[PDB]
């Protein structure tokens, strides 16, 4: 079961800037001293 909320005064959403965030491992392999480029979905820097 659930209940409904009432109308109140809220705050509008704001926008901030990312700083080198959203980087994860794109594969389950091991690379040592390797500069490897891959095509995968990441978060762009300063977006």
């Amino acid at each position: 079961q659930c209940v409904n909320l009432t109308t109140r005064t809220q705050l509008p959403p704001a926008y901030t800037n990312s700083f080198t965030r959203g980087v994860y491992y794109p594969d389950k392999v091991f690379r040592s001293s390797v500069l490897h480029s891959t095509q995968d979905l990441f978060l762009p820097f300063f977006s």
């Binding site: 491992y25 389950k28 392999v29 091991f30 690379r31 040592s32 390797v34």
Partner: protein, 49 residues
């Protein structure tokens, strides 16, 4: 399968090199990292007096 001296992070299974050749693998039983090396190749040369 040679006993390597390099450890692997506990989320990976394979291992490659600059030339994209799988030369490192992990045994799925007791976590041993074993290298992969080509067996043997070459050519016989004949020296004639």
């Amino acid at each position: 399968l040679t006993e390597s001296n390099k450890k692997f992070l506990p989320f990976q299974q394979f291992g490659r090199d600059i030339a994209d050749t799988t030369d490192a693998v992990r045994d799925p039983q007791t976590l041993e990292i074993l290298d992969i090396t080509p067996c043997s190749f070459g050519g016989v040369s004949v020296i004639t007096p």
